[PDB]
Scaffold this motif. Sequence first.
Motif, PDB file in Angstrom:
ATOM      1  N   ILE A  37      45.319  40.854  40.343  1.00  0.00           N
ATOM      2  CA  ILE A  37      45.715  42.391  40.395  1.00  0.00           C
ATOM      3  C   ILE A  37      44.859  43.257  41.022  1.00  0.00           C
ATOM      4  O   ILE A  37      44.976  44.059  41.770  1.00  0.00           O
ATOM      5  N   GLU A  38      43.576  43.250  40.400  1.00  0.00           N
ATOM      6  CA  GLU A  38      42.374  44.140  40.853  1.00  0.00           C
ATOM      7  C   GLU A  38      42.247  43.726  42.400  1.00  0.00           C
ATOM      8  O   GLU A  38      41.780  44.814  43.248  1.00  0.00           O
ATOM      9  N   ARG A  39      42.017  42.581  42.820  1.00  0.00           N
ATOM     10  CA  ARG A  39      42.042  42.216  44.266  1.00  0.00           C
ATOM     11  C   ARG A  39      43.063  42.312  45.242  1.00  0.00           C
ATOM     12  O   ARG A  39      42.980  42.102  46.249  1.00  0.00           O
ATOM     13  N   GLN A  40      44.359  42.480  44.672  1.00  0.00           N
ATOM     14  CA  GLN A  40      45.573  42.727  45.337  1.00  0.00           C
ATOM     15  C   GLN A  40      45.808  41.450  46.084  1.00  0.00           C
ATOM     16  O   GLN A  40      46.023  41.203  47.236  1.00  0.00           O
ATOM     17  N   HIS A  41      45.576  40.332  45.239  1.00  0.00           N
ATOM     18  CA  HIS A  41      45.894  38.922  45.553  1.00  0.00           C
ATOM     19  C   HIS A  41      47.228  38.487  44.967  1.00  0.00           C
ATOM     20  O   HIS A  41      47.331  38.841  43.789  1.00  0.00           O
ATOM     21  N   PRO A  42      48.297  37.784  45.790  1.00  0.00           N
ATOM     22  CA  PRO A  42      49.625  37.529  45.300  1.00  0.00           C
ATOM     23  C   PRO A  42      49.667  36.453  44.356  1.00  0.00           C
ATOM     24  O   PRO A  42      50.517  36.237  43.711  1.00  0.00           O
ATOM     25  N   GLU A  43      48.538  35.387  44.253  1.00  0.00           N
ATOM     26  CA  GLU A  43      48.685  34.378  43.380  1.00  0.00           C
ATOM     27  C   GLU A  43      47.372  33.920  42.739  1.00  0.00           C
ATOM     28  O   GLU A  43      46.211  34.146  43.578  1.00  0.00           O
ATOM     29  N   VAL A  44      47.448  33.246  41.536  1.00  0.00           N
ATOM     30  CA  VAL A  44      46.075  33.036  40.830  1.00  0.00           C
ATOM     31  C   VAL A  44      45.698  31.657  41.564  1.00  0.00           C
ATOM     32  O   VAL A  44      46.589  30.665  41.632  1.00  0.00           O
ATOM     33  N   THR A  45      44.344  31.566  42.266  1.00  0.00           N
ATOM     34  CA  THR A  45      43.988  30.441  42.617  1.00  0.00           C
ATOM     35  C   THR A  45      42.806  29.707  41.843  1.00  0.00           C
ATOM     36  O   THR A  45      42.161  30.234  40.968  1.00  0.00           O
ATOM     37  N   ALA A  80      33.409  34.860  46.697  1.00  0.00           N
ATOM     38  CA  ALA A  80      34.171  36.108  47.273  1.00  0.00           C
ATOM     39  C   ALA A  80      34.081  36.178  48.731  1.00  0.00           C
ATOM     40  O   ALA A  80      35.298  36.720  49.343  1.00  0.00           O
ATOM     41  N   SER A  81      33.362  35.235  49.497  1.00  0.00           N
ATOM     42  CA  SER A  81      33.604  35.216  50.989  1.00  0.00           C
ATOM     43  C   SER A  81      34.935  34.491  51.161  1.00  0.00           C
ATOM     44  O   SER A  81      35.516  34.702  52.268  1.00  0.00           O
ATOM     45  N   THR A  82      35.386  33.763  50.401  1.00  0.00           N
ATOM     46  CA  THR A  82      36.748  32.885  50.486  1.00  0.00           C
ATOM     47  C   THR A  82      38.098  33.795  50.268  1.00  0.00           C
ATOM     48  O   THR A  82      39.228  33.238  50.793  1.00  0.00           O
ATOM     49  N   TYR A  83      37.942  34.768  49.684  1.00  0.00           N
ATOM     50  CA  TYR A  83      39.230  35.693  49.242  1.00  0.00           C
ATOM     51  C   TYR A  83      39.826  36.483  50.573  1.00  0.00           C
ATOM     52  O   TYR A  83      38.871  36.811  51.211  1.00  0.00           O
TER      53      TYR A  83
END
Length: 166
Positions: A37-45, A80-83
């Motif tokens: 949520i914090e990162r605005q990413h749509p699914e947990v990887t 982090a660089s992969t996000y």
Amino acid sequence: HHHHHHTDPIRIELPTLIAKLNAQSKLALEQAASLCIERQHPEVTLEHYLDVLLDNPLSDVRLVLKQAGLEVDQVKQAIASTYSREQVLDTYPAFSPLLVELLQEAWLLSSTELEQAELRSGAIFLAALTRADRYLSFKLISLFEGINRENLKKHFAMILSDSAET
């Protein structure tokens, strides 16, 4: 057969896999979802899960990285660089399909060769490393090339003796 459909390899229901998780191992996933949520990413990887595990010096993952001589900072920066950048989230981030498949394989390995009663981050990471092409971002495959899978599987409990997940 004319009265049986084609089938593919059995898939275990996510809720049944989630129930195998060690307690310490299971708070990290919930936090990996929060990190989502914090990162605005749509699914947990997997990468989110590894990220949160790096914060606990006694997670199985940190213990494996220490044994391999990998610095936590280097690994954190690599993840982090992969996000992705920020995305508009329509729905609450769930586990990605690839991560659910990973839990299944890591549970299969836990219950057989690793002699584990619970699903732990160490088994999840060993399964991911064994199938790096399928489960790990390109940069982490490079980064983790020196981790010896055969040795981690062979000596799993000894290597992880001090873990919070033991």
